[PDB]
Amino acid sequence: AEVTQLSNGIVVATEHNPSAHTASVGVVFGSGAANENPYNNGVSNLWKNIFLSKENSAVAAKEGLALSSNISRDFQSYIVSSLPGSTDKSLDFLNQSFIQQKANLLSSSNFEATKKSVLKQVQDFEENDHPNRVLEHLHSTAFQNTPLSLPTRGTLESLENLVVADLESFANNHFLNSNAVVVGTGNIKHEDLVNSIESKNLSLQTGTKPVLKKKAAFLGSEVRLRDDTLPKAWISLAVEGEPVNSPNYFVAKLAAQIFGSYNAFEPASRLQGIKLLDNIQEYQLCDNFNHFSLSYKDSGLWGFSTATRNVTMIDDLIHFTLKQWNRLTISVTDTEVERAKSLLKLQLGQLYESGNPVNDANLLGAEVLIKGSKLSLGEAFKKIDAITVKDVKAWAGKRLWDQDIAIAGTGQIEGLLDYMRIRSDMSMMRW
């Protein structure tokens, strides 16, 4: 299905899908925002946004190419998608303006306009988008003083000290042949992509990226960005979870799928088979929740996020969901595991098997970059079907039962109790 080969310096990965009507090539590097200082934080955002400038994207639009890019913790990608007959126009564009001739992109009077719009973008992020900024603050307090603690968008105080020297320094240090996968999704075939990446003699750079002196360590902590002038209360709360290439990767995904997501205002979201709903529905404790299992290279996160307007009963919402977490160690049933198996297979099928080949390019690039190949969906389903109740109980006794947590909150979180009551909720006194 996926095929992956290694050229003179570049690894190439394709997912050919002959019933698609767009093809999409690009390059996925292996250094997201986890490879920055607290002082050049926001360099990858500036590279994402100078790759998508108006004068860089006008050249792609005249040839019928649509640009896309993504900054994450581990990886970063730069994707050019077009019609199936014009894959080499895309490879030519990605070469001649991003890979080799990046001196017109890094023009001053282009850098200034892009830096100004990125500053405006993160300023409107930091004061209007409340669930995502507390997920970023959960990351920045769970992994503090380690490289995984950095926001992917950067920081308004960090971003206004950046110059073009920092962008080209990061480019020299990280945009390398040893760090990059060239991806192709859509109905581009593999032999045509390798034949046109050896037809042009495409070479990115020849160094090797710096290796970080400390690994990401989970520190049980809290942060409270309280603001009484906001309507709701947004609370994210997580334990240390599994990183990628765990053996407990799918067990963590399944254990997050057991408690699922919920929306108070959708009538078929109130009828789910979660036993948390018939504790939080009687007094309408929350508006929504979602249980996540975020996996990175070094470490991971496992927890939930809620937004609620019932600011008087936040502590009972937290108490009821953590007493529902305890059942994974003690008394999780057969049925909850089977239901979460079916829902997890559906969620992974909707994530991978989707029509958009930009998303397939991002997923294939990050997966092949971190473990050298890509696990198929049939093998993923055969690894999900093999999970038992004892695997969930063993994983929850390891990672959940009586462990330190990380909390982040904004809004009206006066009703949220301190660290120690919430942490003492993580293990019940066997009743």
């Binding site: 006794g397 039962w401 009586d402 293990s427 019940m428 006194m429 066997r430």
Partner: protein, 57 residues
Amino acid sequence: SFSSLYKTFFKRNAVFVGTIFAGAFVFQTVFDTAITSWYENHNKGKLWKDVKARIAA
């Protein structure tokens, strides 16, 4: 091996408080014996069994 120590003594609260009660039992017994032996030894020749063994010879 602190992991096995935690999982057999502090993981479940039932075995935790059972260990607390068993330790309180044996602690109460041997603590009473240790204090009574030190007290009777610190007061040597002053107790009634010392006086009785003296007047029985």
